[PDB]
Amino acid sequence: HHWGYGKHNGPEHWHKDFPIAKGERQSPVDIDTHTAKYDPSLKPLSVSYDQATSLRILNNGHAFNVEFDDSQDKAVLKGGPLDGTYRLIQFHFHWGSLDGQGSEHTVDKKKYAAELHLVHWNTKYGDFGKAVQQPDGLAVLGIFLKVGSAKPGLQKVVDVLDSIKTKGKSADFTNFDPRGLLPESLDYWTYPGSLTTPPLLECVTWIVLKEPISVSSEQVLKFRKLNFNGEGEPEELMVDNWRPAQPLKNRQIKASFK
């Protein structure tokens, strides 16, 4: 029926409605650190989020999105392997039912407890909708989360989850600064890939940070309290909303570091 992460509508079934699921540039992938090529020509990433305007947080039924005003060049990403300016539209997370799983990308087969995705679209295309139809239309910054120390900058997010418990619920979420979620180092891996939920379009240049951020057990615990279902429907906890690693096929993972 409609796609999800259950046994009957999970990742293994998506190909029936979205044939691109078996495409040549599907995400996520496992990052083999010994095979990634250091590429000296990659520039350092440029993250300018000081003018970021968050507006709302929403439970869309598969995750929670924090949305930003993208009507102007307020929060942009550039540099790295990118040509042009990419505007931040939203961020969200993929997480697990246990601390030993939850990330989409893996490193040398290691899975993290969660993965943060900062989604940006190429301003040359004029809007998000047009950007997803192009090979270089989006840039997603991926950050791994490991369980250890609490992340102060994530707490505001954790605290509003009770108010968007079920699908379709939203809440005003202004004045949130996404700089509080960045690790210290911007070293990264990059490869051409796709969206990880239907429609699975192959329009993403992925930028995955080598350094994870730490969150506390209690913090990740609150994520696991969300529901996939709408209000008044039987309760289904929003857990394991991650797609497993896909074949690399004809692609090279480039590293910005050695």
Coil, strand or helix at 82: coil
Encode 180-196: b = buried (16+ Cβ within 10 Å), e = exposed. Answer: ebbeeebebbbbbbbbb
Nearer to Ni ion, 82 or 138 (CB): 138
Q: Which amino acid is at 152?
A: P
Residue 92 labelled as part of a binding site:
yes
- Asked if residues 215 and 150 have their Cβ atoms less than 8 Å apart, the reply is yes
Active-site residue flag, 62: yes
Cβ at position 194, least distance to Ni ion in Å: 11
- Asked if residues 94 and 103 have their Cβ atoms less than 8 Å apart, the reply is yes
Cβ at position 90, least distance to Ni ion in Å: 10
Q: Which of 1, 13, 15, 62 is catalytic?
A: 62
Cβ at position 92, least distance to Ni ion in Å: 6
Q: Could you count the other beta carbons within 10 Å of the beta carbon of residue 36?
A: 18
Residue 15 labelled as part of a binding site:
no
Q: Which residue is nearest to Ni ion (CB)?
A: 117
DSSP H stretches of helix in 25-149: 128-131
Q: Is 111 a residue that touches Ni ion (CB under 5 A)?
A: no
In the list 25, 87, 117, 120, the residue contacting Ni ion (rule: CB under 5 A) is 117
Contacts of residue 36, Cβ cutoff 8 Å, sequence gap at least 6: 189, 253, 254, 255
Q: How far apart are CA 226 and CA 61, in angstroms?
A: 9
Residue 2 labelled as part of a binding site:
no
> Which residue stretch of 82-90, 116-124, 145-153, 158-166 sits at the interface with Ni ion (rule: CB under 5 A)?
116-124
Cβ at position 89, least distance to Ni ion in Å: 12
> Which residue stretch of 16-24, 110-118, 174-182, 206-214 sits at the interface with Ni ion (rule: CB under 5 A)?
110-118
Quick one: which of 128, 104, 138, 124 has its CA closest to 30?
104
> Which residue stretch of 77-85, 112-120, 144-152, 229-237 sits at the interface with Ni ion (rule: CB under 5 A)?
112-120
- Asked if residues 173 and 203 have their Cβ atoms less than 8 Å apart, the reply is no
Nearer to Ni ion, 25 or 117 (CB): 117
Q: Is 11 exposed, middle or buried (0-12, 13-18, 19+ CB in 10 A)?
A: middle
> Which residue stretch of 113-121, 183-191, 212-220, 226-234 sits at the interface with Ni ion (rule: CB under 5 A)?
113-121
Cβ at position 258, least distance to Ni ion in Å: 28
Residue 197 labelled as part of a binding site:
yes
Contacts with Ni ion by CB under 5 A lie at 117
Binding-site positions for substrate: 196-197
- Which sequence positions are flagged as catalytic? 62
Binding-site positions for Zn(2+): 92, 94, 117
